[PDB]
Design an enzyme around this catalytic site. Sequence first.
Site, short mmCIF file in Angstrom:
data_model
loop_
_atom_site.label_atom_id
_atom_site.label_comp_id
_atom_site.label_asym_id
_atom_site.label_seq_id
_atom_site.Cartn_x
_atom_site.Cartn_y
_atom_site.Cartn_z
CD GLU B 253 -1.54 -2.45 1.63
OE1 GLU B 253 -0.40 -2.51 2.16
OE2 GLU B 253 -2.32 -3.44 1.51
CB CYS B 287 -1.67 6.97 1.81
SG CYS B 287 -2.73 6.20 3.10
#
Lengths: 469, 449, 460, 399
Positions: B253, B287
Site C-alpha cells: 500500500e 496517503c
Amino acid sequence: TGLFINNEFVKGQEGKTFDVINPSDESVITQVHEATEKDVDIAVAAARKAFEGSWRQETPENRGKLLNNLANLFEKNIDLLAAVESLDNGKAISMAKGDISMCVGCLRYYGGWADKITGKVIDTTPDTFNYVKKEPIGVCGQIIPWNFPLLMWAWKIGPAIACGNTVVLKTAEQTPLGGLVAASLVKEAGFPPGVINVISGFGKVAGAALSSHMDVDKVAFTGSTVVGRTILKAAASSNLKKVTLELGGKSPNIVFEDADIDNAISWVNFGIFFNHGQCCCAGSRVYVQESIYDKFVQKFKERAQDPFAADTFQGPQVSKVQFDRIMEYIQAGKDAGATVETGGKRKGDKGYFIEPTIFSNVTEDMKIVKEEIFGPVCSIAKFKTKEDAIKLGNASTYGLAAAVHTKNLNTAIEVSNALKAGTVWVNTYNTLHHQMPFGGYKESGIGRELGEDALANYTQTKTVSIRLG
Amino acid sequence: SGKYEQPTGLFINNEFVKGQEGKTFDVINPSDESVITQVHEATEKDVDIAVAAARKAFEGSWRQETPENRGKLLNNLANLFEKNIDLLAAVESLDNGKAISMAKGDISMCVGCLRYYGGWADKITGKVIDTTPDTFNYVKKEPIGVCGQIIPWNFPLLMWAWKIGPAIACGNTVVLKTAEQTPLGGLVAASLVKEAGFPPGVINVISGFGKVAGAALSSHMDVDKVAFTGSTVVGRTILKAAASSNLKKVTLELGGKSPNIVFEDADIDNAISWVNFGIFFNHGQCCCAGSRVYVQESIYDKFVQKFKPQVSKVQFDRIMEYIQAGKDAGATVFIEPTIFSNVTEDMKIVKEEIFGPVCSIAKFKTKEDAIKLGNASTYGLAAAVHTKNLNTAIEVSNALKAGTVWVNTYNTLHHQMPFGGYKESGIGRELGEDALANYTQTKTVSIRL
Amino acid sequence: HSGKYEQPTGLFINNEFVKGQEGKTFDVINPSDESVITQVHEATEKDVDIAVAAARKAFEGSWRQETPENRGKLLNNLANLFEKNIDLLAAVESLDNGKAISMAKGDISMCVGCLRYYGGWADKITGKVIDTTPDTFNYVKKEPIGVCGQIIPWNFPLLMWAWKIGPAIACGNTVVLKTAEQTPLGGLVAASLVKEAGFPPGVINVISGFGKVAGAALSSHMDVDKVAFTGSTVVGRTILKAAASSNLKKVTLELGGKSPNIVFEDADIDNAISWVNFGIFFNHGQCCCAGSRVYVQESIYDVVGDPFAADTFQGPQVSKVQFDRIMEYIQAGKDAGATVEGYFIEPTIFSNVTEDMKIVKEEIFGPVCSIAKFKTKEDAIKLGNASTYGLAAAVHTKNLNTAIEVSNALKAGTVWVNTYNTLHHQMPFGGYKESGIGRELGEDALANYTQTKTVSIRLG
Amino acid sequence: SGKYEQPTGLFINNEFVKGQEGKTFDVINPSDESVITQVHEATEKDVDIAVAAARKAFEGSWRQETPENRGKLLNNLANLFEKNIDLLAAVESLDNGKAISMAKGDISMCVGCLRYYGGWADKITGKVIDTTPDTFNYVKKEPIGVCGQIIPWNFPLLMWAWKIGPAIACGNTVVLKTAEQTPLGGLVAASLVKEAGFPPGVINVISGFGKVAGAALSSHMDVDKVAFTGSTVVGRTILKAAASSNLKKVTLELGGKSPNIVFEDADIDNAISWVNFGIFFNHGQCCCAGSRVYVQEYFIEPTIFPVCSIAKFKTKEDAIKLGNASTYGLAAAVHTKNLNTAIEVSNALKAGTVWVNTYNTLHHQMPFGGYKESGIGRELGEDALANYTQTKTVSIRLG
C-alpha cells in the site's frame, strides 16, 4: 500464421519469422511471424482501445454467451486442434483429445461465471451508504508455456474474459501453433476486435516487453521459477502491475501400509509419466512404506513397460535443449551412484523420445531429488512413520501439489492437512478440474488459478462510500 | 505527561531485548526538537532471531490453538488499548506530533480495527465442491506463516493495528518493523501484547531503518509473506528483494495523489468543510489526500474565497522543496497550510507526491471533463465526489480510477470497508474481509472413491 | 396463427405424454374470442401420486451418475430450444393467455436468459468447510432436497415455468410442476422440449389440473419434499396449512401485493409518466408487482385489442371470472365517490381516492390505477408502507438523499429507482410480510432448493 | 442454594413486571418434587404488551444503533454469563435437574454462542449485482423485525442463547417465551440483559404455558417471525397458526430418532464411549440423541434393548437403509476407520448432522438443523443469520 491483432492476422512490423520444428521427426513444420517491442506496444494499444468504451458496454450475460460460443467451436474442432497440438508439441493424439475436452469444460465453466461476479453492500456502522464494486483490471498480458499450450491458453483466456478484461497472450516459441488456430476461432465466436490478441515471440524479447509494458495492467506467468523472478523483477521496474505466477515444483507421491497397491502403481505411473512428466505437478519423488517397498518397486517396474498412432502413451519431448537437459539429469543421477531400475537411454535415431526412468538407492539430497528434472525421471524411497512422510515429502522448498494413498481416513486427513502443497490428491494423481483451484504454495507460485479463486486475480474492488444524513 | 522508559527493546519472544551489535538510533520530538530518548536497534542478526521466534511459535504452538481463543486474544488486546487509550494517544501525539484530539479518533480506530478482526478469527471458511459423484473435493484455508510487516509513521499505532488484526485472525505469526521516525508506539503496544496473554513469538516488534532491518525482512529466506506501507519507490524496493529471495508474497500500500471534485449543486457549506478536512487532516500525511481539487466553471470564484508538525526535518524539507517549485512554476499561491490556485494542468506540483499540507485548485466545465481530469494520474489511491445529483454521483464514481471513492464526504474511513489502490498505489486491498485473503493460502484436497 | 400444431394434451410423466387414469378432460378458452381452443387431460390424486413416483424414482436413481457440469449443460440445451422456438412459444402464450405477441416474445427472451443463468449455476454450488476445530475436520455439504412440487400461476405461464424449473434442476432436485388451470398449453409445449434437451425420464414432469384436486395433492403429498407456490395469498395460506397437516415439507410462497409508485417533484419529466404507465398497465395489470396506487408530490399532482396483431400493447383478461372480479372492483371504485378518468376492459384511473377505501385495500389484478398526493418525504414512506403487502415499490427523483433514504425506508422486497417492472434473473425477487415467503430470482433461489449437511470427523 | 423472590415477573421494557391477569404458576423441582416458588404467567395481553414493546424498540432505538455496538452488547452479555456461570449453572440444575458439571459445560456453550454472533453483527454483507444494462443494482440485508422464540426445557439457557444470538446480531428485537417446566433460567439471563446495556424492549422474556402464550405469539398480527424448538406436533400447530394469522416466517426445530452405526473396523473403545454419551447424554433428553443403534455382525435408570434399541446389519447398503428408513432424520453417526466407508455412508445418510467417530459434539460455528419432519430452517453457525435477515433488491435506472 501471423500475429492475431484486432481480429486480423497482421504480420511482424519488422517481418521477422522464426522456425517451428516437429519433435517427432525433427523436421521443420514452418515459420511464424515474430513480435518485437513495437508489435507488443501496438497489440497492447489494441487491447486498451477495446477496454476503453467498447467491451465495457458489453453485458456479462453476453460475455458468457461469447465464451460458450468459443467452447462450442473448440468442441466442433476437437480433431483438428488435438492434431495441431500433437504435431507442434508431440503428444499422443488420444491424450490431446483429452486436453481439448479440458479446454471445453474450462471455457464453458467460466462462461457461467461472467454474470455471477458481485460486490458487497457493507452496512457500515453509521448513517451512510457503502457499496463495494468489482471491476475489470484492464489490459491483462499472459505468458503461457508449452506443456499444455492450448489448455493453458484456455485457463488464462477464460477468467480474464469472464471478468471483462482485455488480454494479450504470448505463446511460448516452442508451441506457437495451437494458440493461433484457437485465435481464428475467436473471430467466429463473436468477440469484438481487440478484445483478445495472440502473440508469438520469445520470452527474452516479446515476453519481457509485456512484463515491462507501462500500459499493461496485469501479467500472469506460467513457467520456470527462474523466469518468474525475472517477471517479478520486471513488474517492479515498470508500473507495479499485478502479477500472478504458477511456477513449477517437484511434487511428491506417497503410499502407505493400508493403501491399495494396484491403484497406487497405476496412479503413480500416471503421477510421473503423464505428459512425459512435462507438466508442473508431476510426481518425481515417490515414497513407499518400508513394509510394501520391495514388492511395490518390483510391481512399479513391470508397469513402466509416433504420437499420431492410437497405441502410444509417451511421445517426443519438445526440443533438444529440453531433451539434452533431461539427458544431462539422468547421467547426473547415475553419476551420483543411484541405481537404475529402468531408464537412461533415448529411443531411436530420430526424435526426442526418452524412456521412463526410475532410480533407487538414492540419498535425500541428490541433484535429481529436489531440483526440477522435467522429464520422465522419478525417485523412490522407504519411510515408516506417519511423521516421516511429512518431514520427508515436505522437506522441499517447492510445494505445488502432493499425493497420499491410504485406506485409513485418519492418516489421509492428517497427512494431507500436514502436507505443504497447493493441491493434495488422496488415492488419485494428476487429476485437475476447473471447479477446484490450482496453485503453488510458497515458492511454487504466487496466486491460485482454477475454480472461483481465479476470478479474484482478474477483478478488483472499488469502495464507494456515499456518506450523508 | 511524559515518562522515562526501561529496556526500549526489540520485543522478541515476549521479552524486550537489545541488538547483538549493541546499536541504538535516536528518537526526536518534532515540536521541541529535543531528543526524547534512545531505542534499541535491530540489524540482520536480530531480524533472524525474530523470524526464528515467529517460525518457532508458528510450528507446534499456535497450530494447536483454535480460532475462538485466537479470537479471545485479539479482544483482550483491544481491551488493553482502550484501558490505556490516553497513554498511547500521548506517546503517539508526542512522537508523531499530532494533536491529542486524535486520542479518540486514531487510537480508538485501532480498538475498532483490532476488535473487528478478533471477530473474523472463527469465521474463516474453506469450500466443498460437488465435482462429480464418487470423488470428494474440498478447499481449505490455512495460515501463510511468518509475515514481515513494515509500517510508516503517519498512523504508527493505527497501522500497527491494521497489520496485526488480519494476520493474527488468520493464524499467522508476525514480525513487525516500526518506522525509524516513530518507534515509540509499537513498543508500548508490545507490552500490551504480553498482557493480553499471547504466547511468545506470535508477535515480535522490531526497530531499525529501511537500509538494514527493512532489507533483512524483505530478503529474508524464512519469511513467507511481507506487507508494506509507504512511498512508492521503497515499494519497488520491496518487490525486487521479494523476487531475489524466496518469492514470498508481497502486499503493497503505497501512497497516492488523490482528487476531490465539487459540482455546482454540491451544498457548498459541506463541500468546503470536507475538502479542508480532506487535505489538511493529519498534516497531509494521509496517503489518501485531496492533493488536487476541482470545481465547476460556474461556481469557482465563489468557491475559492470560502476556502481561505511533520515527523522529522527531512519530511519537513521536501514540502519546502515542492513549495519552492510552486512559485517557480509561476502558479498563483510545523508548517503553514498552503493553497495554490490557477495552477496549470501539467506540473510537478500536481503530479508527484507532496505528503504535506498543500492543495492545488482546478476548474472544470462538463461532467466528462472531471472524469478526464481526475483519473489523469499515475497515482489512483482514492478519489471523492461532492454533488447532489444521483445520476451524476454514481456515473462518476464508476468512472473514477481509484480504489476508494467518497460521495459527499472525504477522508472518512472504516475498517469493515476495504481500502487500497489500483494504479501503482498498491498491490492488494487490506480492510474488511478482503484483508483476510492476503494472509491465508488455499489448499485443494481431492479424494477419489 | 401458425398452421403447424403439435399441442400435446397429455400429462408429461416420465418423458411421455400419458392420459388421465380416470380420463378427465377440461376445456381451454381463448380470451380474445371466447372460443374453446381444445381440451386438455386432467390430473387427479392418483395421477399426482404416479407423477411424484416418477420424480422420486429419477431422484433416487438417475441422479447419482450425473455431474453438475451436465445438469448445467442440459439447461442450456433447453434454453437453446426455447430460443429456437420463441415464435411458436410466443404464439401459444399469446393464444392461451391472450397477451400481445410482442410481449410474449419479450417473455420468452426472459425464459432463455433465466434458464441459461441457472445452467451456469449447476457446477458453482459450493458448501463450506469449518476449520475452527481442534483435531477434527468438519465440512458442510449442500445437497438436493429431492422431489419439489411447483404450482405456477397464469400471469406469465412460461416465464414462471422457467423461474421454477431453473433453480430446482440446477441444484439436482427433480420436480413436478402443475400449470394453472386457465393456461395449461405453454407448460406442455415446453415439456416437449424437455425430452429433446436430453433430460432423463422423470426428472421434469408437467401436470395439468386444478388448484383444488391437483393443487392439494401436490401440497399434501407425503412423498413431495418441497412445494413452491405463486399466486393469490388466499391460496398460500391453504398451501401452508396443507404442508403442516401432511409432512412439514419446506414451502416457498410468492403471493401478490398492491405496489406503490412514488414521484418526487425533483423527478424527471416524461419518462416518469412513461414508467408509471408501464407500471400498472403492463401485462394488463396481471403482475404481482404492478403499481396499483401512484403517489405524486402536490406540486405536480394535476393499445386496443387483438394480441396476434403488431400494434397491440394491451390484451384480453384471462377469463370472465377475472373480468368479472375486475368489473366489481371498478364498480366499487365509482360507488365510493372516487372520480374516474370478447373480454377486454379498457384501463381506468381513479382520483378523489383521498382515503384508503376498498379500492386501495386489496389487490385487483387488472388495469386499474389509483392516484394519491403527498408533499413531505416521511409521508410518502408512510403512505407507501401503509400496507400488509410489501413486494415491490418505485421512486422517481433526481435527488440522491431522497432516493437512498426513501428506498431504505420503503418496505418492499424490490424497489425500483427511476424505472418500473424491470426484473432480471441476476437479482432476487420476493415479498415482504404477506407478499411472500422466500426469495425467487438470482442466487437466493438456490438456497430454497438445496439443503446443507454438517459432517464432523473426530480424530484421536 | 435457593434465593430471594424479587418480582419474578415478565421482562418487558427492561424491568421485571407482572401479569395483567394476576396469574402466577408453580415451578417444581424434578429431584425432590418440592415446589420451588411461583412465577407469574403471561396471557394474550402480556404478549400484546411485549410485542408492542419489541416493536416500539425496533421502530426507534435500534436505527441509531450501529452493528459495531450490537456486537459489543452481545459479548457484554457473554461476559456476564461468564461472571455468574456458577450461579446460572446451579439455577439450571435446580430448575431442570442436570449435573452441575454439565451446567458449567452448557454455560460455556452459551458464552461461546453469544460471542460468535457478537462476531457476526458487523459482518452482515449485502450484494452488488452488475446488471447487464447501464443501471446500478444492489441487494441489501435488513432485520425482519419482532420475533417470537419458543424454547423447550432441556437446554433452557443454552437454547435461550442460540435464539437470541442471531436475532440480535442482525438487528431485530426479540420476544422470548420460556417453557412452563423451566422458566427460571431465562429470567436471570434477563437480569444480565439490562446490565449488558441493551436499550429497553430489545429483549423481552415472557413466561407461561403452551396453549395460551404460544398461541398468542404464533398468531400475533404484529410479530414478523417465530422460531420454535420442541415436539413435531406443537410445530405443526405453530405452522398452522402462522398461516391463519398473517404469514410469519416460521423456522422450527423438531427433535427426532437419530442413529449410531458402528462397523467392527471402528475402534470399539471410542465407539462405546460415544454411543453411551450419545444416548445417555442429558438423559436422552436432546433432539440429537440416537434412539436406535446398529453394529456389524423422578430419576429413571438407563435402559437398553433414555432408552436405546440395538440391531445388526450385514453389507454396507443395509446400514444406510436402516438409518434412513425412518420418518425421522435430524442427526446420525457412523463409527469407522475406513476413509471410503466414512465419506460414502455419510453422504448417503439423510441427516442434517452426521458425526464420524464422535457423537453429540455440537459447535456454535457449525449449523445444526433438521431434515424431513426434523425441522424447517437451520439455526446455528453462519447459516442462522439467514433465518433472521431478509433481502431487499434496489434497481437504479441510469441514463
